[model samples]
Target chain A: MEDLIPLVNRLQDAFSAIGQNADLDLPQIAVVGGQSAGKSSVLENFVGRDFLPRGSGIVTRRPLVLQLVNATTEYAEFLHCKGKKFTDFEEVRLEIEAETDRVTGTNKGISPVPINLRVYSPHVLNLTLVDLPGMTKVPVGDQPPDIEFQIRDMLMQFVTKENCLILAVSPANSDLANSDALKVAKEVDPQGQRTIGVITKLDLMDEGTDARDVLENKLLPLRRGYIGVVNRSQKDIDGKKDITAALAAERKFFLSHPSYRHLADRMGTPYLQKVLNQQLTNHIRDTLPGLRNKLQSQLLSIEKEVEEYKNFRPDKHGTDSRVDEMLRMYHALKEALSIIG
Target chain B: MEDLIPLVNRLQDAFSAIGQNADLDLPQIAVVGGQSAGKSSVLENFVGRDFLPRGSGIVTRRPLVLQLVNATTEYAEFLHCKGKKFTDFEEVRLEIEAETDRVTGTNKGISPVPINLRVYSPHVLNLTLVDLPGMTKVPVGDQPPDIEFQIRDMLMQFVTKENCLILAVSPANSDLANSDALKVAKEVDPQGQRTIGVITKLDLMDEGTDARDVLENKLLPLRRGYIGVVNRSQKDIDGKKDITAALAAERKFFLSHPSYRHLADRMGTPYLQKVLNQQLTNHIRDTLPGLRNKLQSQLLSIEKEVEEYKNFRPDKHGTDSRVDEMLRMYHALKEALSIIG
Candidate 1:
């Protein structure tokens, strides 16, 4: 149901209100790719906005909890700066990088604290995605020596999650066997039941070959399947191509490619975005059944917590100090949590 | 150590930087007083500023995680709005209410979500306290009916923690047994080892009847003992008395009182603030010993996670997909977390 995501947002908010985060198995798309494998491009394409910090030197140093709301106006807000709004998408990118550095180390060290960025715009559907730092095998510049291990380990925590929908992004230029993002997904998501693959940078792939088998999921055998997309190259961005313009360029690219022409409807960013919406919607639907089975079993012990505070009835049956009033309170809390199930 | 609180703050920042919270058993003073049991006054007195949202109609709807920093300039900052500076404590008061309502229900339903308020001022010591909504017996106004049970259960989660130092704030006029904050402290902390009691409103106590026994810790026998303080009367606020002026007035009141004159050194707001600083600094010390015991036990299982990724060496002796590099990464993470110990 469309209701599931918003309801989860409410649950997340409810838990956060009290100084805690709910450890519920909520379904969310986890975007994973090797560093510079076009993970950021794929996500920016989904939002249909040029909000993410681009350029070669830039990278996602923090796990980003991104929410795209289809609102009347185009604006972005950071969770910490919830009271303020950034109307310009350019500011959103600056805000993300600025805020990322606020808590992340001055040296090239990364922390697990997530930055929640919400973009409310009429251009996109309501979607929630966890954008992680791309997988890197080695450190460069002043980076921590164990940067590769740190990034991979940090990602494993998110992708291995029960409700995590791993969107493994790999560039089309490579022999799909070398796809670390897809390989890691299979490690945890075994059959790829919860993994959706995005094959990016089709524009850069050798002209003689194609990702037809990969695009058809013939090569990987992923149950969730893969979608191929041609994202902006350095040349494209150098020409100052807006994402909206870049999205259409790729749509035409897929439509003209001989072997891929047949798979055009199943590919491209437009389809990719729609597929994510559908993927997450169904993922949430499947998650709730597992969650519903849990609350009662979970409630079994918390119900005991309700009993420990046995109110010794020495009251005048009014409010404060009365057992009846206290009893009603316990019941109210029971339903408060129960309402979630 | 004077270092512990700031270190924990750094650790907290480190955790937040990555998208997770460090669930370390960090010692913190939790301020618990009954509804309107001079909790707001006592806390305001602790900061030596009028920053809390006041008046009888106003109640704490969300738990307040307050940090008083010893700084050269006087200012308040909320964790969410980490960018801007709040020079006015009055705006700080209004913002607390506004932000509390942002996540908490407008139906007077309280949420356990906390408001992070840091007051950077030369007036106060560096101390962290969890200011929970006062214990309530009944729902008022348009409040949800189970308000009492909700508040009690909520407080239980904070006070029962291993590192929780319960700062029970009770008005002096009541019989010591009727002190719900003190009574509850005894429940979670059977030996009162982590409980510090504050007997407020000594000025309001009946004439010829002093809190001599309670102040002496002869009544309830809390190991950490109690401190007595006379806070602002309703008349004091009405006369436009600033908190700085009110502090001198209460000091004089405690000094002039006959029974309390002998115990003036152990009484009032100044001593209470210093006592809290000393109390938390040591509580953190005791907590680390317990925490150090558990991390290795925790590492026992996580180390198994490191082994799950056994690499078959087909690498170019470099990064990415190489076992040695990955192994180093795991070792790095082990020490990264291990360094905390």
Candidate 2:
């Protein structure tokens, strides 16, 4: 089980190496929400660190494939800036902003070229979190009007993948009724079978009111259900309160609260993180056989293509070697997995 | 007189150094034409080389400020590619493509950044040629509908400058009425006084009727007047015809023709090139005083702006040194020119 997620990650790396188009339909939890919906807050809480560029409209202009590996000590690294260990979370945040702007520019436009970030920490759980650009409908500043359509198209492509798990987030302070997360997720996963609803800003909810019904899967129920989390408020954040303090305070919010005290263990960030790890782990395990079949089928098809070129067609050479070598690793991986399973 | 154009080019380079916004409004021949108007062909003909990228759709998506220098040997170089001289014209074409794509990408979109090409050739005369993207109304292939608007705005920025000489190009085979070059140039130069009308595709005209009237400035009279030149036809180009051969053929077409044979020496490409050299040289001489006045005024203004920090305003330093040092050279240059004049 420990080897399972790591092996899948290696397969993802190998597949990415083969070509940009090659996809084994790997299971990954895509954390999605509206702009200012605390999606980054949830990811930060997961790492117990602050490392995302925070500010105005569309802070994240590219998909961030954050791979959190549980290690002895904390350090961050990026695929683009290889061999450099970033100890400062602020530096990591700056790197993310710089890398995002490198591709998407500062025009608030989103791109499919995801910034792959690997954070190694003892605090973090083994989870593959795909943080996308927050959903924004209005074209503020110099952003074009069709930016909304572009974002939707970008969101749909990632969410449409069958192996992609949805961590649909929305602010609990609001109605939570017409949230972009629900609408977008519902379009892909109609029954919400693969969707995990995340209710942020639990502290901001009206006095005496609670998200107990939603958290308990009684309101807008999903197969995996919902998790309520209390992010660091604006006042707390401006005061320069650490995320560790926020996380500590968050645990107390659910425990001390009259409505949430009973389900304190199941609510908050740790549980959410735990659930995501388990969900992704099991999801990956389940999809492995199908992935193996896909690898073999691709190998056979690619072999036939390479064979036909040798037998009949005569044009190009030394192109499909990338795919052939890519399939070889996977086919051997299937052998390793078959013996282990 | 020989030093004036080179000095003005240095000033341009200096002004560009001061900042992208700094403008002394130096005299430059801006080649304006609609798509398929043989604008590149005209510039290539001027250089006596096939150095521009030629294609079906909006080929030139950026302003190319080509500086043709009369030199000992034939060689082309770009400011972007410093220290590397392209002896092969095809290499210059390839470098232009590469440098263009570095900024504009392959998205069929236009950018304001002009590629600076300096062709130092014995075959060419000293001329600063600003070749803008050929004007297009329709959004063919991947281009946007408002691409025409984008192009006009780009063209206007260069053409609107008081010292900029307009080389308005049009196909002479058809009616010399309502050409984009004429319309756009007319908007800026109401009397067509600083505009050089270039009637291209003279060979494509119906054999019965000649473009003698336009060539002689009898049709749509301008202050500086028109010149008709023949570009290599599709058949000529497809047969791997060289520009040298094409120039030879063009001279013959004018000298041997019945109507044009009378003023053959005054109407051919050689005459056109000579006229451009004389006009551009005289235009630079005329604008030098204005440019000098503008430069000193800018230096005084920029110095005052810098002085305010010391006298009244507080904060920020070392930024305007670029502008301050830029003007210092021109101020000294005025001293140098005053002696020569």
Candidate 3:
């Protein structure tokens, strides 16, 4: 009844836009920030499919929603918040340092604390990959209405107006100094046009970490009053020092300037609109050769079943290293599919 | 006062026969991290919203948490490093970015930086979320804790029990492996088990970067220990190459396997029977459909609106850029649904 749910969604958007035809579906697309700012390894390297769950240094505080489907099917469901509701994603099986400051009493040397889980991965659709809450580096006195004003009001109610689409990722000088995280990115996209300003570490910025004078001297004048600046590197695979040709000439001077041509027109209209029509040329002629031979035999049999789950050790399975840390995450998923292939 | 605030429900013996009710109408679940590994992205991704503001690179900068709501919701109201007391959501936005880097005191740079609206948002709810700043990063010449000691342990007085949960983000590739974060991750579940985590942008790592080997061999062994790692990322939008190929395959197979033939002999019987079916599904259902749609839109039409807002440009008013940002988000939702509609 939030005021009659927005007057019943404004009379159902005025009787569905007076019997409208189409053009509206483009909304739900999130890929938020922090924690190795890779967010579930970039949605399993984009549809190729690894599903979700990933780490290093670590901290994935579950909230996956994969729904894209079509790979036959493999059901998925996990949810937990438990202060009152949402507890059953398979009766919850995630465990990591379980005592979170004596059950959220966080005071004595306050340390790692973050719990969340809400999964629904059925292949993912329309587009919804939130993955937020990594504005770390705290410990100064946790200010702003406490905990950066409740993480900027739970990301303004998960990007309100329910049209959600953000991916603010900062690095490259933490999106230009003075951070409460760009005021929680201007209260979740305040005039920054649905938000999009990624910079992420540039091969560990060596030349005295200039990285284009920190992206045009401090993240383009602090994201020029909000949004439109996409530049990534996440240190290209780990080490092959190919500054991707000076970071693709500083991301083509920030998407062929005109003061950043809408970041090269919404990054090529949502990344090459289905490979520029032809729906990916009919999926590269009826599904790219049986989907690249079933992703090279299902990613080489889940990469030797993730090297037999990283040689299952804990002193030969006496247990407690969490199955050698779940086979050391399948040896980093076989070294992250040998560096995203 | 909101039902007098205080609530504690502890039931163990696999949920003491549901009725005569173990500890009288039980409902308590809390667990967090941060003593060793990376905090599981604030309990499976920002209070289980499935990854939000967190992700930085280089195999996630140490500081772990096996789990327990990813370190009880992002560093349970942090900021109490040395001086103590508390206050660190990012230390009043890094003390206004260390007072604009001390009045534009540049060495190999340029400066302006201001945008610190205090992590702006509508955030709260005890389920913990934080863990990083346990000290380390600022090396290159040192002197940059901007405040220090986990920003004063998130401003002390946080850990509000009622089954608390918090988990801030991190992992934008650990701001490009310049790594160093952590101030605390202790509060070992005195009972409340629901926290959070996030590893935002790890400074966009370069080279075949696999963002610091997916946070040290895949997000510090999925912290079944608690420490919701941190760094940060939100690249904004357009599937950043699928969030960097799924955080390099979720840190190459982020692990925890050994129920292998009763892994650790069914540890605490699958976590105390998932805290006794989450205290019997919070005493039977508490969906609160988005808080009952914010209290039935605040008792209908919230006093018939007056002022509302949007106009994201529409190509300088040439008209029809999706009805000028949806008529300014529908007149700021009809004056916020006529004042909290």
Question: DockQ of each candidate's interface versus the true one?
Answer: 0.01, 0.01, 0.07
Model 1 spans with C-alpha error above 4 angstroms: A4-7, A293-341, B1-341
True-contact fraction for model 1? 0.00
Estimate, for each residue in B1-341, the C-alpha lDDT of model 1 and write its tens digit.
54444545544443333323334455678888666667777788777768887543336778787766777899877767868899988898889888978877565668876677778887777777778887654344466646667888888877878887888987664445445686578678877888889987676543335678778877557788999887776656767788888779888887898887888988888898888878777776666667656545544644564456434444465555334433443453355355555
Preferred candidate (DockQ higher): 2 or 3: 3
Q: Which candidate ranks first by DockQ, i.e. highest?
A: 3
The DockQ for candidate 1, computed on C-alphas, is: 0.01
Please estimate how well model 3 matches the true structure, expressed as its whole-model Cα lDDT.
Answer: 0.33
lDDT of 2 by residue, A186-240 (tens): 7789877689999987875534356777778765668898888987765566677
Specify the poorest-scoring 10-residue window by lDDT in model 3 chain A: A1-10
TM-score of 2: 0.46
TM per candidate comes to 0.45, 0.46, 0.25
Report how large a share of the reference interface contacts model 2 reproduces: 0.00
Interface RMSD of each: 35.6, 30.1, 12.4
Tens-digit lDDT track for model 2 on B1-341? 45565655655555454345335576678988766677888888888778898643457888888877777888877777757888998898888888888877887777888788788878777778888887754343355646668888999999998888899998664345425687788789987768898998776543245677777876567888888888776556667889889889989988888988987777767777888878877777777777767766765665665466455524364454544664555564565355335
Per-residue lDDT for A130 in model 2? 83
Of candidate 1 chain B, the 10-residue stretch with the lowest lDDT total is B13-22
The lDDT values for all models are: 0.70, 0.73, 0.33
After superposing all C-alphas onto the true structure, candidate 3 shows an RMSD in angstroms of 30.5
- Using TM-score as the measure, the top candidate is 2
